[PDB]
Ligand binder design. Structure first.
Ligand SMILES: *n1c(N)c(C)c[n+]([C@H]2C[C@H](O)[C@@H](COP(=O)(O)OP(=O)(O)OP(=O)(O)O)O2)c1=O
Ligand SMILES: Cc1c[n+]([C@H]2C[C@H](O)[C@@H](COP(=O)(O)OP(=O)(O)OP(=O)(O)O)O2)c(=O)[nH]c1N
Lengths: 90, 104, 104, 102
């Protein structure tokens, strides 16, 4: 069916990519990848990404992770328990 | 002191959670790619609407008034709740797509 | 096959938005970045409105006046920060435009 | 210090030109609200990448190297061009909706 791999956990990805990496420089880099990610959708239409050519799907996973990696970074530097902070909202 | 994230939820855990709260709030339908995308973009917006006034030569995020750091967490979450939501919808295994990256 | 008004103009807008701001001493906050994050914060409200639509659907002309009135706001707050950004960047936003089309 | 903008083209003018441009390479089909939003949401990113690595009270844009200062224009140019086409595609009076907000 569909499923995410049991790891790397949010804690791994935090440990793994970790001056640049200060607060608002990281927030501008998050918005950037959201900018690349948003680009792989602009000239589409309502119909999904599960059926895109390979070089596209491949970029769809690439840019998507990038965003995570920075959101990861940004929060791990704002000292927010990204993982827990999620369930609390639930 | 070392600041580390807790163990779980796993991204897979973060999925199976949002995955259900809506399936009870009957959402998944409007949950179409761009719909999910465009949302992530409003939260990202809501995320920057805290740093747009703060200068990086300021008390930094850690040292943010409770209610600010509170909002900050409630925001960093949603940006994650939708990133993982968009991924799953694309059939992307966000967790593994990260490894393929490390393969630099 | 539509039309904007002849005014205001971008300097006319770039002008008042000066007067306006630093009339709330809102000019001390026009440092490139703070400004860039502000655009992103408003570039995000604008999305929050289209996260529920689809382009196969009738543009905001059919939207209920209330939804169609809040769309004029964001579209306007987005141009305002964009202008406040360009200016602090000493960019002739108006020329930078046309002098970018004598190309692609 | 305090900068100005040439008296034209006006917001409407830009509107037409882009049209001619986009009416040339059959790009109107490409201009559906959400397209120009994401289209714009993304140029704001390219525009975000520029400053991501820069700094608070460091050199500063206007003192940036040429090729960067030039890329900067590009990026600001684009953001408008899309703001202008979405605004237009939504049948929204962009210049006037800016005063009405004062
Ligand atoms: N509208 C539509 N629908 C389309 C397809 C295209 N345009 C024009 C207007 C806009 O200014 C230009 C995009 O130019 P670009 O593709 O070179 O900018 P960018 O992609 O960011 O440069 P790069 O080569 O991708 O790095 O297309 C419409 O108005
Ligand atoms: C907070 C603020 C506001 N400004 C002025 C300029 C914008 O054209 C107008 C819109 O402000 P905004 O706070 O974004 O209006 P709202 O969107 O309704 O605010 P929120 O609902 O809280 O997002 O405010 C401004 O110049 N600088 C500044 N630091």
């Amino acid at each position: 069916p569909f499923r995410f791999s049991p790891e790397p956990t949010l804690e791994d990805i935090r440990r793994l990519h970790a001056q640049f990496h200060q607060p608002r420089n990281l927030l501008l880099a998050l918005v950037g990848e959201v900018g690349e990610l948003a680009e792989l959708f602009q000239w589409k239409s309502d119909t999904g990404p599960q059926a895109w050519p390979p070089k596209e799907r491949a970029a769809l996973q690439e840019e998507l992770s990038d965003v995570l990696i920075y959101l990861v970074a940004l929060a791990a530097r704002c000292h927010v328990d990204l993982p827990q902070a999620v369930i609390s909202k639930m």
